[PDB]
Symmetry: C2
Subunit: 149 residues, 2 copies
């Protein structure tokens, strides 16, 4: 099972982008998303989608991201421009058979995430969207396989 941990969500600014992260996570085969800042309106939006389009994807908000990432029972993946290329490590991640937590949304020089993660993974050295980074990570993990709701 893959869980996305989305940090740096600002309820009063980032509803759209965080929504886009959650829908991408769901569509491309993650089972859950955890969001740092509590956002009941986001929960209601996403839970609405899940109701309307099916399946058991989970959203929780108001999470302590360092604790969730630190104590996750499985592989901790940090999506970041400061990371090695996904292709270098994706097979080993996939072949591990473990649950995976993928951290999206880190900023600054992301020390606390780098202190915790098992893998720090980039797609390109060009500026990209975290939404597109998450899509590519999930696509590579699931090897381009399609999903059934």
């Amino acid at each position: 099972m893959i869980t996305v941990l989305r940090i740096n969500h600002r309820p009063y600014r980032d509803k759209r982008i965080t929504t886009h992260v959650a829908l991408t996570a769901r569509a491309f085969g993650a089972s859950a998303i955890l969001v740092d800042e509590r956002d009941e309106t986001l929960e209601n939006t996403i839970r609405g989608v899940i109701s309307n389009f099916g399946g058991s994807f989970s959203i929780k908000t108001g999470c302590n991201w360092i604790q969730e990432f630190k104590h996750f029972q499985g592989i901790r993946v940090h999506l970041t421009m400061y990371g090695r290329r996904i292709n270098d490590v994706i097979d080993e991640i996939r072949n591990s058979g473990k649950d995976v937590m993928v951290l999206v949304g880190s900023e600054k020089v992301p020390i606390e995430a780098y202190e915790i993660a098992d893998y720090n993974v980039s797609v390109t050295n060009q500026p990209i969207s975290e939404v597109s980074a998450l899509a590519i990570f999930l696509d590579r993990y699931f090897q381009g396989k399609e999903f059934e709701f």
Copy 2:
């Protein structure tokens, strides 16, 4: 060459999602993006990226999307969840040797997008971000090689 056509840009509502679309278009190997509503902030942002990171990508805004799509000289692709499975059609599109214009919308897209397109293309039947739809479209078009492209 791939040109992205981004519609339903509403610059006084949000510029982040369209900026993310443009950054994705550029990084994933499109040559150009055309955006329906004029947005000089967007133009300058993306031109700033080109200045610092290289390559020859172009952005224009304030475009009549129906006219651009209808009269584009090449294959008109519309990315939509209500389209055909991408893997059914991506090979024909790639092997045509034609230029491609890829329409990416937001909220509801006008029915004309579906009627004009040569191919209405679904990366998934589930609601997703236009950013991730575009990423996967380009990724499949370029068969995973686009991150080797030089800027």
